[PDB]
From Swiss-Prot:
Site for Involved in NS3 ATPase and RTPase activities, residues: R274, R277
Signal sequence annotation: none
Protein name as annotated: Serine protease NS3
Binding site for ATP: L12, H13, P14, G15, A16, G17, K18, T19
Part of the full-length chain shown: 1681 to 2115 of 3419
Species in which this protein is naturally found: Zika virus
């Protein structure tokens, strides 16, 4: 695997030991061969788990998620996917890693897609080796891969709203269930219905995952209600998955606004990862997977793949060359390569709007490419009337940095800035100049 020009897809089934067995073997061989190596974790939770798998191997953990005292002589670095792409974008020296290992390499966040594009292009140039670890490589068509233990698969209607009758199978179960929902708001309603029925429910989503996942270890629970973030190596001691088989799809409309379309079917890869939360223990056959819909190719035209092109167009590779998306997922976007390349000063603004601003890539790009500076928030208020953001069915309002109460009406409307209470609270703080 470790030879230049090699990209290996390590596509062992979910729970086959890619992280806990195979990775430490790859790392030992890399150190022996004096290959400067990066290991890419999708989350801080997985970074901390990798430290346990790799303990007493000389690895530099480029994350505050791990309390380790480094020797200073390690030639293996571990960081999050997003950290890797972040550091490529910034005026930060990133070594030209001889071996590039991505764990949970199906992750469809823009920074993960961009990282795959950058790494696979370095491999194609003959500069590096790479290993992509995932049970569900791009374009996988198999929602029902092998497992450590037999799974009971059942197609069933799954509630997506509070219910009073007709779903007794949901609450009659005495074990632990992981339930994949398409959105935070959707999960909140199902969680409230379960709580009212006497169940103990933990909710996970991208903003809370890194701190709420610990509750799955520290608290007794009956249900985890999770978005798609638990497709990325989240391990539960569960005996059932309930899968809506639904997601939201960010869609760029007329190159002018982003909507959250759907809910609509998940990809086969997503369905396989959701189901793959169970069937992991060969001593516990007959974990259940209850699924409420079919799969479809909903990654086609999904905003994350366009956003990954916006990132890759702004990463230096060699002279004016631009990294390509990883070939198996390159047709999910119709973009002109280089169309999003920014001049130095607009690139810095773009980066800051994503890092400190915490804005979606697409929205950071619209602001930066308009020649607006990071602290200039006038664009949050001068949009068209149809871009008015609502809070409890009346326009959302903030006090501007000038002390003026104004309706939130951004010039570019990205539905991800207000898809739930927490998102809108963060965007209100941004519009107010508070970060
Ligand atoms: C042991 O070596 C290192 C440890 C930590 C870091 C940076 C960690 C960090 C969190 N903070 C931000 O500046 N970048 C990152 O994600 C770099 C090297
Ligand atoms: C998949 O990429 C994304 C990147 C950023 C965001 C917005 C996060 C946030 C905190 N910042 C705020 O202004 N609204 C908010 O929830 C959503 C998705």
């Amino acid at each position: 695997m470790l030879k230049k020009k090699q990209l290996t897809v390590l596509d062992l089934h979910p729970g086959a030991g890619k992280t806990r067995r195979v990775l430490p073997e790859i790392v030992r061989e890399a150190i022996k061969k004096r290959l400067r190596t990066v290991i890419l974790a999708p989350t801080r939770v997985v970074a901390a788990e990798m430290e346990e798998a790799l303990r007493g191997l000389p690895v530099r953990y480029m994350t505050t998620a791990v309390n380790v005292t480094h020797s200073g002589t390690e030639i293996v670095d571990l960081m999050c996917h997003a950290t890797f792409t972040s550091r490529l974008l910034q005026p930060i020296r990133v070594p030209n890693y001889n071996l590039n290992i991505m764990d949970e390499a199906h992750f469809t966040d823009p920074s993960s897609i961009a990282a795959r594009g950058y790494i696979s292009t370095r491999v194609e140039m003959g500069e590096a080796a790479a290993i992509f670890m995932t049970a569900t490589p791009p374009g996988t068509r198999d929602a029902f891969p092998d497992s450590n233990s037999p799974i009971m698969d059942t197609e069933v209607e799954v509630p997506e709203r509070a219910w009073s009758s007709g779903f007794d199978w949901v609450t009659d179960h005495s074990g632990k269930t992981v339930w994949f929902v398409p959105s935070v708001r959707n999960g909140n309603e199902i969680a409230a219905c379960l709580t009212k029925a006497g169940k103990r429910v933990i909710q996970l989503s991208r903003k809370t995952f890194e701190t709420e996942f610990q509750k799955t270890k520290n608290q007794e629970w009956d249900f985890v209600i999770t978005t798609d973030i638990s497709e990325m190596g989240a391990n539960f001691k569960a005996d059932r998955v309930i899968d809506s088989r639904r997601c939201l799809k960010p869609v760029i409309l007329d190159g002018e606004r982003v909507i959250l379309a759907g809910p609509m079917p998940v990809t086969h890869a997503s369905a396989a990862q959701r189901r793959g939360r169970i069937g992991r223990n060969p001593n516990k056959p007959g974990d259940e997977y209850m699924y409420g819909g079919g799969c479809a190719e909903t990654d086609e035209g999904h905003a994350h793949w366009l956003e990954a092109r916006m990132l890759l167009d702004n990463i230096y590779l060699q002279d004016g060359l631009i990294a390509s998306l990883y070939r198996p997922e390159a047709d999910k976007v119709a973009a002109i390569e280089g169309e999003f390349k920014l001049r130095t000063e607009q690139r810095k603004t773009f980066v800051e709007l994503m890092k400190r601003g915490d804005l979606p890539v697409w929205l950071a790009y619209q602001v930066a490419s308009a020649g607006i500076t990071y602290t200039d928030r006038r664009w949050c208020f001068d949009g068209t009337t149809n871009n008015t953001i609502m809070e409890d069915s009346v326009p959302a309002e903030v006090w501007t940095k000038y002390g003026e109460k104004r309706v939130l009406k951004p010039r570019w409307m990205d539905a991800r800035v207000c898809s739930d209470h927490a998102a809108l609270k963060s965007f209100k703080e941004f519009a107010a100049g508070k970060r």
